[PDB]
Amino acid sequence: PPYTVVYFPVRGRCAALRMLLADQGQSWKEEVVTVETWQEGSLKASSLYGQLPKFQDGDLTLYQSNTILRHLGRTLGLYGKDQQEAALVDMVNDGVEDLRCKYISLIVTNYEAGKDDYVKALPGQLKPFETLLSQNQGGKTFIVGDQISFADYNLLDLLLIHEVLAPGCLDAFPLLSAYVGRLSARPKLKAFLASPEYVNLPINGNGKQ
């Protein structure tokens, strides 16, 4: 620390890492980049790969939402108990990222024509996470092992935005349904999810959800 999130005025790819920081009792600063400021060019030109989020942690500057999640995961001890669990955490997070990419593609490039096919395919895309929960303490704790990991926050975000896209999509998945309610009720995370800094941002920048 100190932590600074540099991003567009949306939840998007920073939602999960913000939930992680709030739930872990961390403070951070939000530095907002508007679409007009981004269009100007200076920050884009100065970013490593031409994209946001940028994240500052003391004198470390990071780019890439999943890099930030893994960093916070490693530094705050949210990375499983041993190397095998760490692999499982990664496997879950990579699967979340895969579906998030498909979600973003729908939202940004193909919402109207693609939503129907996307929602039809959704149960099959969500089932693996239910299966993973079923194989871990009957789905009663976390996605991997018995302590929260960075993957849980990313998975929780994915589930939350999918319930908005396709209300009731978790109804067929009792373990995923209970997991969302259960993680969301964690006192610091509950407060954050209720707070203006979360509630007053749109999920995505183009108005679609």
Q: Which residues bind its own copies (CB under 8 A)?
A: 48-50, 60, 62-64, 66-67, 70-71, 74-75, 83-84, 86-87, 90-91, 94-95, 98, 101, 124, 128, 131-132
115 belongs to an annotated ligand binding site = no
Binding mask 139-168 for Ca ion (x = CB under 5 A): --------x---------------------
Nearer to its own copies, 89 or 201 (CB): 89
The runs of H, that is alpha helices, within the chain are 15-23, 35-40, 42-46, 65-75, 83-109, 111-134, 150-165, 174-184, 187-194, 196-199
Contact in structure between 29 and 4 (CB atoms under 8 Å): yes
13 is in an annotated binding site: yes
Contacts of 28 (CB under 8 A, 6+ apart): 2, 3, 4, 5, 18, 21
Q: Which of Ca ion, its own copies, none interacts with 197 (beta carbon under 5 to 8 A by kind)?
A: none
- Is the bond preceding residue 2 a cis peptide, omega within 30 degrees? yes
Selected from 98, 117, 146, 171, the binder of Ca ion by CB under 5 A is 171
The response to whether 47 counts as a known ligand-binding position is no
